[PDB]
Amino acid sequence: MCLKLNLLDHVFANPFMNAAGVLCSTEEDLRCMTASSSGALVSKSCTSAPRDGNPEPRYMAFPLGSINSMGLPNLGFDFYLKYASDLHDYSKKPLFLSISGLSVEENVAMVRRLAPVAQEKGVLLELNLSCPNVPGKPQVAYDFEAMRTYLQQVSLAYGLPFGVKMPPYFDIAHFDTAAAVLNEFPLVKFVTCVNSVGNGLVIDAESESVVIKPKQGFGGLGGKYILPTALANVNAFYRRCPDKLVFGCGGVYSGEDAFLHILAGASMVQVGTALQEEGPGIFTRLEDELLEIMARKGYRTLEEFRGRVKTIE
Amino acid sequence: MCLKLNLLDHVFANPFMNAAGVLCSTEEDLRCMTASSSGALVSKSCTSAPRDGNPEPRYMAFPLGSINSMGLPNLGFDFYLKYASDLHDYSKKPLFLSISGLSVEENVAMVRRLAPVAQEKGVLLELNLSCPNVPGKPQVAYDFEAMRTYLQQVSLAYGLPFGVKMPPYFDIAHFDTAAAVLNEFPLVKFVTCVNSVGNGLVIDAESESVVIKPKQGFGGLGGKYILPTALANVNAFYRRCPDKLVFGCGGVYSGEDAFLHILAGASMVQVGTALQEEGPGIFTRLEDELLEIMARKGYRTLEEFRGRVKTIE
Numbered sequence A, B: 001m002c003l004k005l006n007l008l009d010h011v012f013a014n015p016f017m018n019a020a021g022v023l024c025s026t027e028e029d030l031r032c033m034t035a036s037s038s039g040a041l042v043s044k045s046c047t048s049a050p051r052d053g054n055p056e057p058r059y060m061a062f063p064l065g066s067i068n069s070m071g072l073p074n075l076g077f078d079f080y081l082k083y084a085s086d087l088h089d090y091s092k093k094p095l096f097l098s099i100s101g102l103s104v105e106e107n108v109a110m111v112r113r114l115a116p117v118a119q120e121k122g123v124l125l126e127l128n129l130s131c132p133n134v135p136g137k138p139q140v141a142y143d144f145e146a147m148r149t150y151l152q153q154v155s156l157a158y159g160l161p162f163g164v165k166m167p168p169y170f171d172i173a174h175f176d177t178a179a180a181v182l183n184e185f186p187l188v189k190f191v192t193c194v195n196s197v198g199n200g201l202v203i204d205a206e207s208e209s210v211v212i213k214p215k216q217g218f219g220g221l222g223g224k225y226i227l228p229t230a231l232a233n234v235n236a237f238y239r240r241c242p243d244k245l246v247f248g249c250g251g252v253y254s255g256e257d258a259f260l261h262i263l264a265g266a267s268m269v270q271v272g273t274a275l276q277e278e279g280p281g282i283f284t285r286l287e288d289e290l291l292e293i294m295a296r297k298g299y300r301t302l303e304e305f306r307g308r309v310k311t312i313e
Ligand SMILES: Cc1cc2nc3c(=O)[nH]c(=O)nc-3n(C[C@H](O)[C@H](O)[C@H](O)COP(=O)(O)O)c2cc1C
Pocket: A019, A020, A021, A022, A044, A045, A059, A066, A068, A070, A072, A098, A100, A128, A165, A194, A195, A196, A221, A222, A223, A224, A226, A249, A250, A251, A252, A270, A271, A272, A273, A274, A276
């Protein structure tokens, strides 16, 4: 029985990795993720310039998940490019670098400089589309004309295989339209479903107060709240993008949740909220739990069940 | 100490009611909801003609909530109108009738006929804008030009105060656009936030199967999964629609959950999944629980805290 995968011309010991933004902002964080049993890691979504992000408190967690409005705090692109080019040990596991420029031009500028490092070291790009653009316009992946622009410009500037991080969708017509845009771009080799469920609001009954400071307490939701939404999006894109990989993200706390993701279509399975809460020890537990479900079922490899979710009649 | 309130020129014993679709399809269901301790009831969303709805299984519930693709099974409009006009005992509690025609014309035809019964009997209209859609087009409330058309046409045809059932939104620019549409219509006097979170996917690990038959297992989510989504939409519309009421719906299992809806801005509080699961006894428990939290806090009225959620700095 094994959890090994080979994809994107890399080899992975197992399908687990952090979700972008968790345990990946500093060199310390990246070294920690590298030392963990995860099969890969991804760096914090970066901007050209370093950012301090939003005022605190800007993350809170609870039994059923988390809420955040971090504001893209990050050490800036040059830091993450240096990590990728000079510090990361590729003998340990593969590295994804996430970018989240505030404009299409900022993304182009970063990808242009990432490309020779990607070619030489094999760092993999995850472009974050679940990201602000013009204020008063929907996030990029909810504005399909902007999404197409961003992918055209990045495809031209980068010229190498990459993947994209998507927000959740809730309407079949959106699945249809979004997948059809992605399927215009052959360099888009993987699609990560999903980023947080946008602008939720957690309220504490005792204090009568929101629990995060930015945006009057509105922020993105992660965790147990979002698992069925994550599954739906993994499977919707798995079905509509047959020449691309889907990576699953949302609501993973156990090997069983990972099994469901993989049944839906996931290749890699990313862990955000639960990793934030439990720490990097989670990865040994998830591996063990997933192997136990595979053993009970007679499954020897991930491909035996990936995308094999059954429907009824 | 009592939870009685007045809204929309009606008096309500308490803010609780069923959510449309739950315990409200047949005459038996309606009589059960009338006999309960709820403050009001709403009928099943109806179409001009009766519908069987989707193949079973089409509803399933779990510890964290429910998934459904009912397909608008209903007895048809003539039945609900007859219930409103001849069968409902208005001395017991107010009645809302939910309409969900599959086109604008179908809605106009129903509301023209409802108008006189509304005038004579005081039945209240909830127009369901969350109703579902054709390949190549999003649901009405996610297509702001269609929404504006529906509301123009219904307002002209009905000519009396009414409300709208909204799907959740996830993007602040969408809150701003949707609320601005609603605010164009002075006869829209209440906004019910939210309908189910669309197109989630629940998978059973043991069976490796989706749990509902229609739509390859995709359906609307209710229950604990959606409470922070529901509170965000309640508060977003409460803030943007100062001349309207907001009715909260989503994730209510306890008086504490109802308290958070009211803090967010809710005037009435609708109960879907929890009611389906617990039955109509839930209403006495919710009342008791809500009055207990009020008592502990020193609140004597709902208006003392409605919409008074605190933000940080
Ligand atoms: C604290 C925090 C920071 C995050 N930052 C990013 C980020 O920089 N880029 C990104 O693509 N997603 C980011 N996310 C979203 C996660 O990558 C993930 O998509 C989301 O939390 C859902 O997974 P979960 O249910 O395992 O938390 C962040 C989430 C959290 C909680």
